């Protein structure tokens, strides 16, 4: 028999609409055939239309939960054509930043899994912390989510005083939620029959089918790209990556759990490390000037004027560049024919290829492990899309 | 004036706890059963 | 003045399913770190009404059923059998008091699924009667715990009289002798009343593109008033079963505020147990019926029948 | 004659409930699978044998205990082999 | 460095054997999950009473749109178009021309509120802080075409909230 | 006469306000914002708003992101099987005209296109606090109803 999936559930959940086209026999699925673009919005075509300055807001609504992510991977592949580098202290704030996201992306991730699986109660305790993390957001950038925050050359303004502290206050407390989530959830027989044993896929198959992140990690590879091509300062911090056995669903349940733990314990060193200076590279060709010198100076206004029309001129060249986002190895081949606008951006989206894989992983399964499969894969049909 | 940005305390932040903490509660195995079958007993009698 | 008697049995049941709404969204907004309705009147305690305003007024949704007898006797039995259920139950004193009470309970419960079937039968979409019928097939499976669940705990009562479980918990309350049976009592029910984390039917219509409600707003009330006031039934018939109260003849409100209060708390724990859990797979929730309540309800009938007269406990027949 | 009265007025109102609410809201304008087929014959052959079970809180006021019991854990046991060989015949998987 | 998050052997003494029997049969993991949302029932709960409270926001809010003066009531705008350049969707549309008095200033400034995406660029690139996103966000309208605004609207805009936009510029420009 | 079809608006209005259930269309971005308007600092549920409310069961729908060419005709199909009475609210800049991606050849310019709108929120995304001033807006909408007012003088 055939069976087609519904778009979403009835519940309020934000990882956008899927058609699943599936073939039926008793119990077992069969064949899963996913159906996108249904939210497929020409972003690659629209970027060619901007400046390098008027596409990063793009990114934010790739994987619109990890957006300040997005922002890094972009920011470093414009940095790397344009040769230049932004200033310790907005690296720090980069990385300080970027696993705040990753604790944004890792609650949706597990709790919006549990509730699409009847465990409705986590997913109101931690959207209560993600609250107060979209204030962290919302004090640097303005915005809770959209921040268009980091920028080629660092980040737009400097931490407003007082934030840091804030910072330290919630990162007190967020593992004792952790703990509470883990009550509910890793040692419950009913959690463990829904995700135990589900969807497991090989070391092998893993690799060949381009999968990345905690899809890789969860099959036992010992692969983390903020271990092994750092990016930004991450030489710089100490954590662990948490690595799985079974492959399953449950292992990588555990490993992004884990990887909540090790957030906070970056968190911890960038709130210590954090550097003084400038937060944005000190070259007005490619960052603007503070608005003071640009109301003073002739040569800060004209660059003022030209980087907010014309925008920097990137030296022609292409580069793959990658980083490891919440959900996996999140890249972009940016492609510069030396203009200030980019000829080509691809977009590689980690659950691009994590969704191609739905097929493999649910054979042999029931219909109802095909919900438990997606949200291991944790997908957000935004950058699936783009 | 001198340079004021948000900036770290002198001396660090205190310590942040992250690893995973689920204490231990309950009986063992056999104390749990024991009085199980002690209530069985006494509800019988 | 029996008419009174009835009337004053039934409609205090419908406003008690009404407001069990309000209490399941509260109790459950709490758990939650958040409050639930609290505009719609003080604390909410308009929001019930409403919400059946809202419900009845909405335009009913046009019914394509293969069977028009079949598409309105659903909701008659379902809510007519909900309301039957009530009348042997002794708080203190019964409605009606029948001497086999207990059976006419299993009796009328095990009629139950023709709803469930004839509405699937009546929806002319093959993936309605795909899900009636998996949900009869659930319900059916967890009755035959609940029977022989029943039957072991009768053995210490030696009756089919409902007023006789009183009388065999006035020194104890059964939930001691029998806490093994209660506990797959109260699962059972959950089961039985497709609650959370067996709520498969509410489950699987989410996922299946096509397994739609196919009743009005008006008519698909009357099935959750039914579903609703069978919950509230099922828990105060628990504790009449192993939460027995002591009756005093001369004083029998004083009997009715302390089981109404046990039947509120079992009743919460419903909720409560909807908070915490995640679903249970269809085959999950199957196999715990048949390979490990029904195995281990089995022993402890074989149990049940040998206690009392290894024991010298057997009760009396009348 | 008290319960059927009771019974008259539970199902009457029901009735009267979903009559109106099928028609006075009306003015306001504006793929057979063996496998579930094994469980319900399953549970009507499990059915039966609850039916003999049924009068056991009688059968134990006997004087002739020494019988009672031996047929009433008999009963019981055939149902635990009823349950073994379905169990042992894969009867109850669903894959 | 790397860790295993389930790589552990369960001990098969008797007593660690009968642990184990004892939650299966005890039910005891998933009692404890019952202690976690109870707790939570006697916890204070995080709703805020909204609209009579309000979530905390910070100067740098980037909210509804307005065009701003000079204390003496001249308009800062002077019809550069960098904010026009910059859009990223292309949001504003501007005309002008020598004003009667000689002055450089709009004839046409329309930013269309549902192609915008609320960036904060415009402000960034304007160079006399004449368009800024103000502290408003409860400007939902019935209609799309009330969402279109021109330039008395957001000149209006300017003029009933200037005195809190100034005092969020005040505290927030010495970090632009 | 005019008194009692005054106040049966009323009630049928209060009624209606009172127990809004929302089917949200979580498109894209937006619906994030639209989870933490259920989330608790919010709390939807609190006002009658429900949490999950099936298609059929709903009064209101919430276009909570972009609207692509391939996707219109499953949410106007779901439009069209909603019971009325039946209200839309237009989420974000998406939603309501397009938005960054107004002059994609694959998206819907404004969801007004394919349904009628009730109220239109805008921002990218619009806080979840001003989602909620959208609902509370739609609720003061049918506040102002005169269903009955307009039947008696036909
Ligand atoms: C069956 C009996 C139905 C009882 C009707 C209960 C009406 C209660 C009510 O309207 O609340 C007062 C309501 C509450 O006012 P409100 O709903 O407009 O707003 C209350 C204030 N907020 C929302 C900020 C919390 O008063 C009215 O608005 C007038 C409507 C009266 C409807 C009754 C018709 C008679
Ligand atoms: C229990 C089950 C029963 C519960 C009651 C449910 C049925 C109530 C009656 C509804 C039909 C009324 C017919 C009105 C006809 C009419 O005037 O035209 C409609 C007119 C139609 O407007 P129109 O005539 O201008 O036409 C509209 C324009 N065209 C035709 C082009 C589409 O107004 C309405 O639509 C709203 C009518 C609301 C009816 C309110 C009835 C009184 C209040 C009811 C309270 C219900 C209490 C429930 C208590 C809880 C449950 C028990
Ligand atoms: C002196 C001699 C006397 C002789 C008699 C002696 C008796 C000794 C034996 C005593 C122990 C018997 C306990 C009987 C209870 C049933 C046990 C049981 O069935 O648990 C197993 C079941 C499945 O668990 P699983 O981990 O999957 O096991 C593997 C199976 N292959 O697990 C489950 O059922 C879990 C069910 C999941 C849903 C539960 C959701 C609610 C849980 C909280 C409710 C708490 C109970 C409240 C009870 C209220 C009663 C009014
Ligand atoms: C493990 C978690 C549980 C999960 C499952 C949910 C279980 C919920 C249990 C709810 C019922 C618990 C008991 C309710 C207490 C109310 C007690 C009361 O009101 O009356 C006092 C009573 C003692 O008196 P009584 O019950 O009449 O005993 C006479 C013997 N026939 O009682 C004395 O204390
Ligand atoms: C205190 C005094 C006593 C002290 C000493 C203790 C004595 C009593 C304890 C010893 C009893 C012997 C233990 C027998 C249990 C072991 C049976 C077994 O291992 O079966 C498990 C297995 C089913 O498991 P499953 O995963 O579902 O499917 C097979 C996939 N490999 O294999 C199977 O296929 C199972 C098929 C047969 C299942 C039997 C079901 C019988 C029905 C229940 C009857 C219970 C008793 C009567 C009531
Ligand atoms: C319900 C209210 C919440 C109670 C608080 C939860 C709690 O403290 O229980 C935890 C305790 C420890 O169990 P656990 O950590 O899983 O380790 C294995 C067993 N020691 O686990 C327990 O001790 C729970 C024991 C449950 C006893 C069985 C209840 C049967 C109910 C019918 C009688
Ligand atoms: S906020 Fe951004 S999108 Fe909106 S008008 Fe300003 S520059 Fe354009
Ligand atoms: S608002 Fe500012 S940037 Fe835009 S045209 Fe006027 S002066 Fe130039
Ligand atoms: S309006 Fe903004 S937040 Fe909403 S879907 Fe569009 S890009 Fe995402």
């Known amino acids: 028999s055939n069976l087609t999936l519904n778009f979403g559930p009835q519940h309020p959940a934000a990882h956008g609409v899927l058609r699943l086209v599936m073939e039926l026999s008793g119990e077992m699925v069969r064949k899963c055939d996913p159906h996108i673009g249904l939210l497929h919005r020409g972003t690659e075509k629209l970027i060619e239309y901007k400046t390098y300055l008027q596409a990063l807001p793009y990114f934010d609504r790739l994987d619109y939960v990890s957006m300040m992510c997005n922002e890094q991977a972009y920011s470093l592949a414009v940095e790397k054509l344009l040769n230049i580098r932004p200033p310790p202290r907005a690296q720090w704030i980069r990385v300080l930043f970027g696993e705040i996201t990753r604790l944004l992306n890792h609650i949706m991730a597990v709790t919006t899994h549990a509730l699409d699986i009847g465990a409705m109660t986590p997913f109101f305790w931690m959207f209560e912390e993600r609250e107060k993390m979209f204030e962290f957001y919302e004090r640097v950038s303005g915005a809770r989510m959209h921040a268009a925050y980091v920028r080629p050359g660092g980040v737009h303004q400097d931490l407003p005083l007082g934030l840091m502290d804030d910072i330290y206050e919630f990162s007190k407390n967020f593992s004792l939620r952790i703990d509470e989530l883990e009550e509910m959830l890793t040692n419950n027989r009913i959690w463990r029959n829904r995700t135990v044993d589900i969807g497991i896929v090989t070391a092998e198959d893993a690799l060949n089918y381009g999968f990345s992140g905690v899809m890789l990690r969860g099959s036992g590879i010992q692969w983390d790209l903020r271990k092994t091509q750092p990016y930004d300062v991450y030489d710089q911090v100490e954590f662990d990556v948490p690595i799985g056995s079974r492959g399953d669903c449950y292992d990588r349940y555990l490993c992004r759990v884990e990887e909540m733990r090790q957030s906070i314990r970056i968190i911890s060193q960038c709130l210590n490390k954090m550097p003084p200076g400038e937060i944005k590279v000190d070259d007005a060709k490619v960052s603007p000037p503070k608005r003071a010198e640009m109301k003073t100076s002739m040569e800060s206004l004209i660059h003022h004027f030209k980087l907010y029309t014309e925008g920097y001129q990137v030296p022609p060249g292409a580069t793959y560049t990658a980083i490891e986002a919440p959900k996996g190895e999140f890249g972009v081949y940016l492609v510069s024919d030396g203009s200030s606008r980019p000829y080509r951006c691809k977009i590689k989206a980690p659950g691009f290829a994590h969704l191609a894989g739905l097929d493999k992983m649910s054979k042999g399964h029931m219909l109802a492990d095909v919900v438990a499969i997606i949200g291991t894969q944790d997908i957000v049909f935004g950058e699936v899309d783009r | 004036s001198k340079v004021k940005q948000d900036m770290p305390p002198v001396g660090g932040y205190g310590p942040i706890d992250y690893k995973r903490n689920l204490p231990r509660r309950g009986l063992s195995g056999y104390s749990m059963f024991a009085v199980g079958i002690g209530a069985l007993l006494f509800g019988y009698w | 003045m029996f008419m009174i008697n009835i009337l004053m049995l039934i409609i205090p049941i419908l406003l008690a399913v009404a407001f069990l709404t309000l209490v399941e969204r509260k109790v459950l907004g709490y758990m939650q770190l958040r409050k639930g309705p609290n505009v719609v009147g003080p604390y909410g305690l308009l929001q019930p009404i409403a919400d059946a305003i809202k419900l009845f007024i909405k335009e009913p949704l046009r019914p394509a059923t293969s069977s028009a007898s079949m598409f309105i006797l659903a909701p008659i039995m379902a809510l007519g059998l909900a309301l039957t259920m009530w009348i042997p139950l002794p708080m203190p004193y019964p409605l009606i008091n029948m001497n086999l009470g207990v059976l006419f309970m299993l009796a009328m419960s095990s009629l139950a699924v023709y709803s469930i079937l004839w509405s699937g039968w009546a929806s002319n979409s093959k993936y309605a009667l795909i899900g009636a019928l998996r949900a009869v097939a659930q319900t059916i499976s967890y009755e035959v715990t609940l029977a022989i669940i029943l039957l072991s705990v009768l053995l210490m009562s030696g009756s089919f009289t409902l007023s006789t479980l009183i009388t065999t918990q006035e020194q104890m309350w059964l939930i001691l002798p029998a806490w093994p049976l209660a506990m797959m009592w109260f699962i059972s029910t959950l089961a039985e009343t497709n609650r959370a984390p067996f709520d498969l039917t509410e489950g699987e219509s989410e996922l299946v593109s096509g397994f739609n409600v196919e009743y009005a707003a008006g008519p698909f009330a009357l099935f959750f008033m039914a579903e609703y006031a069978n919950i509230i039934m099922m828990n105060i018939f628990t504790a009449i079963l192993f939460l027995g109260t002591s009756h005093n003849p001369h004083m029998p409100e004083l009997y009715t505020i302390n089981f109404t209060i046990k039947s509120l708390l079992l009743t919460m724990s419903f909720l409560w147990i909807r908070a915490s859990y995640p679903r249970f797979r269809y085959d999950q929730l199957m196999h715990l019926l048949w390979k490990n309540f029904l195995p281990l309800t089995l022993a402890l009938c074989m149990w049940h029948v040998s206690l009392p007269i290894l024991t010298s406990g057997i009760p009396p027949q009348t | ?95 | 460095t790397y860790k295993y998050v389930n790589l552990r052997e369960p001990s098969m003494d008797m007593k660690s054997v009968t642990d184990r029997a004892a939650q299966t049969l005890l039910w005891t993991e998933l009692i404890r999950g019952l202690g976690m949302t109870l707790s939570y029932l006697f916890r204070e709960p995080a709703t805020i009473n909204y609209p009579f409270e309000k979530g905390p926001l910070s100067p740098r809010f980037r909210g509804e749109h307005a065009l701003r003066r000079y204390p003496s009531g001249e308009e800062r705008c002077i019809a550069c178009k960098l904010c026009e350049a910059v859009c990223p969707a292309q949001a504003i549309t501007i005309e002008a021309e020598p004003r009667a008095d000689g002055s450089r200033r709009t004839t046409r400034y329309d930013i269309d509120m549902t192609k915008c995406i609320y960036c904060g660029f415009c402000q960034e690139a304007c160079p006399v802080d004449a368009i800024v996103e103000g502290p408003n966000f409860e400007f939902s309208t019935e209609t799309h075409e009330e969402l279109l605004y021109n330039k008395e609207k957001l000149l209006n805009n300017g003029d009933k909230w200037e005195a809190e936009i100034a005092a969020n510029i005040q505290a927030d420009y010495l970090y632009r | 006469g005019e008194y009692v079809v005054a106040k049966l608006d009323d009630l049928i209005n209060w009624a209606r306000r009172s127990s809004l259930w929302p089917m949200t269309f979580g498109l894209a971005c937006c619906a994030v914002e639209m989870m933490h308007m259920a989330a608790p600092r919010y709390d939807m549920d609190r006002f009658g708003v429900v949490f999950r409310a099936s298609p059929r069961q709903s009064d209101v729908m919430i276009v909570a992101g972009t609207l692509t060419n391939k996707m219109a005709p499953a949410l106007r199909k779901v439009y069209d099987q909603m019971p009325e009475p039946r209200y839309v609210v237009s989420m974000g800049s998406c939603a309501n005209g397009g938005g960054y991606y107004h002059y994609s050849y694959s998206v819907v310019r404004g969801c007004d296109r394919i349904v009628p709108v009730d109220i239109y929120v805008p921002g990218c995304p619009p806080t979840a606090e001003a989602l909620l001033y959208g609902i509370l807006q739609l609720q003061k909408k049918i506040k102002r109803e005169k269903r009955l007012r307009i039947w008696y003088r036909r």
């Open chain 4, 1 to 95: 004659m008290n319960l059927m009265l009771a019974l008259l007025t539970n199902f009457t109102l029901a009735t009267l409930l979903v009559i109106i609410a099928f028609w006075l809201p009306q003015l306001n304008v504006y793929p057979f699978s063996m496998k579930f087929f094994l469980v319900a014959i399953t549970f009507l052959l499990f059915d039966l044998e609850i039916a003999l079970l049924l009068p056991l809180p009688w059968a134990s006021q006997t004087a002739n205990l020494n019988t009672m019991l031996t047929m009433a854990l008999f009963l019981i046991i055939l149902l635990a082999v009823s349950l073994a060989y379905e169990w042992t015949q894969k009867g109850l998987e669903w894959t």
